[PDB]
Amino acid sequence: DIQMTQSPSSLSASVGDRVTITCRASQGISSWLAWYQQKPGKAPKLLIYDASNLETGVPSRFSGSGSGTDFTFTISSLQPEDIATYYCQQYDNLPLTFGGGTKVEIKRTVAAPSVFIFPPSDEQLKSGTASVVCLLNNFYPREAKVQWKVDNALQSGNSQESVTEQDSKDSTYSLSSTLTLSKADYEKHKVYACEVTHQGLSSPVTKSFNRGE
Amino acid sequence: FNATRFASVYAWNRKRISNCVADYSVLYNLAPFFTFKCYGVSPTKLNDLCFTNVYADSFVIRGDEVRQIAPGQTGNIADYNYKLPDDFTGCVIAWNSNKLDSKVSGNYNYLYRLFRKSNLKPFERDISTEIYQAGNKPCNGVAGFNCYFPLRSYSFRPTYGVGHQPYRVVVLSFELLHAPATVCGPKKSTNLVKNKCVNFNFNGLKGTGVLTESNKKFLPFQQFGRDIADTTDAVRDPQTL
Amino acid sequence: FNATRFASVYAWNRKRISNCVADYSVLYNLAPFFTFKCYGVSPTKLND
Amino acid sequence: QVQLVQSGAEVKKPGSSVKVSCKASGGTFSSYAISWVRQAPGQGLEWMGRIIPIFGTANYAQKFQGRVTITADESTSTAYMELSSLRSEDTAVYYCASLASYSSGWEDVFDIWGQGTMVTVSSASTKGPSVFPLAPSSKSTSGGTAALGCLVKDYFPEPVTVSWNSGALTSGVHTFPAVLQSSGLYSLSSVVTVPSSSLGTQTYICNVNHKPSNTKVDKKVEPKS
């Protein structure tokens, strides 16, 4: 099946700025292209049915142009409803194919995380398993690093991490890690520590607790 | 003509062209326009005439099926999808569209009707697709003999030849009575000579005679004056009126 | 239709037809026939 | 006017066939048609197939022939999609949308869309989450505020709703996307940021609910020093 590629994959611009999107195809489609905007995990909204014709009710803010093997999609102004992935839909042939999507996030500026730590509770320890969680809140850019150094020795392969999307309330992000261990391992070790590095910390930040605390 | 979107030969698209200056050389100069057939008018003269009204139709059909697009013809397209009046005047234009409309066992979006409850009237359009009644067997749900669905597709597979390959057709329907007129060619105007025998072409009306300031009270909604036997006795200037 | 002396498609049966009426409104359209179709032209046109 | 309403989420073990359907309303059945598309997590859309019920014609993408069939009827005015031999990778949401390449010469791009049906494939069976509160340190304070949380683990299938004070609290409430364990069970987490003075003086409680099993869980949150 004929494929297409969207370039670049990610964008960052402030509200009110002009933004452009493009995608690439291996063979020349005869202008049989359409464009969609989709909120991550939500129903797509149809934008453009013919390469340069907007759909019913679509605002004039959206437009596009191009021909042959390539096309371009642009917006006159990045507006509040714009943190979404833009897909260029190919329908030149019977087998429908969809682009990888171009994602845009509001360009807000670096913000330091709120670094917090978690020694586990008794109710969990009664199950025979122990855990420790490290939390980062409301930071920018998209990612930050968290590492476990139980007994001041770095460890790998016993923790799970989850990350949120961009927080549109202040265009920041959050991250946390959950360390997992057994009761025997919990008793064997003495000190548990989490260390953090991010775009906005003057130096690595350490949070830790001991057996008696 | 250059629109990416062309409707089916039923529910056929119709666009009215008014208050413009036409130039038909941009059409027949195009390479893909292999077929350019006109009834009641010739290709060479289109740019010299002026028309009281203009209407353009468009649709997609097979190659050999374009044969059915002519006055008073009979056939699936001529009778159940699109029929020209016996006295139609205008041009029928079609060209190959495989590069656009051909897909492997696809192109369902372009449809037609094989049969209908009754033959279509000229320029009659039917958006509905209800099932033809069988008559011999009660039929509200689907049934046998005649309760088959009217619509059906070529599938426009590229392996098809011109006999089944897609043809993109646009039909120009004209009224060629004289003014009032709003659509016609780039013919330049000239000063108006009076009281001297002069060849005149008033909005497409060619003739030879002497032009004099008329003293008969034309009402504001009248645009021509005919003597006995259809002879044009008077005409109003389309510029100074 | 009703002979059914063609139980195997291998070595299928053939017949030639001429000099008759061919009233398709009855043929291939009565209750016993579950399906019926014509290619290239509708049965309504073929009827006449 | 035409609208689409889909069936509820359907779940079963790997290697089986999952049913999915959505009603046809507005106009009638014989002036209607359906195609189905896939939206798996962390990726874009995908097209499965198309049906025009009254034609009897149907098509499927090169990726889905044989594994997929489509049927519909006028008595109930709805479409019937079925997928067979599902992998764990098949976990995704399936949308049915109104077809446009069915008549009068407009194109095949989907205007009307359904609500989406979630299918998740795993060896596990319907059971509730395991929940345990959290106990942040006193050194976990910053800007006169502290973060508290409760975790959700070992539940299948989706969805799960996490709320604070049974939904009575919303300021600073944060949630996390779920993750899937190797055992085939999901997990979730959520936190809320509150002033250091308010906590202890005012009760803060996490709440977790599991719609498939119709069970509810809640517990208190307190830091420690």
Added chain:
Amino acid sequence: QVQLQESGGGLVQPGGSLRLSCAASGRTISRYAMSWFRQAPGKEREFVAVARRSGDGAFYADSVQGRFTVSRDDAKNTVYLQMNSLKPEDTAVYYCAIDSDTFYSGSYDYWGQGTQVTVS
């Protein structure tokens, strides 16, 4: 931890051009790409520009692309920044960061000190 400090900047008349510089000592400078940042009063940190070893021109944020330039000199362990036609917006406090990872394509920026800019 490593040391890093700026030089230049300061008060200027509106509409002029200003220079800025930043350097380190006693450690390898090539292994890290040196980046530069900004903070408006009462508002958080901003990215501006960065220069790499390849020397493929400059690299900018959204706003600073049409008014800024950057260059470096490894032999002197110093980086340079250039500003044009300073505006009232240039009443903020900057920072000088380094992509603190050994020959990393990405960046974990680290800065030691920052200085102010103010149009009179």
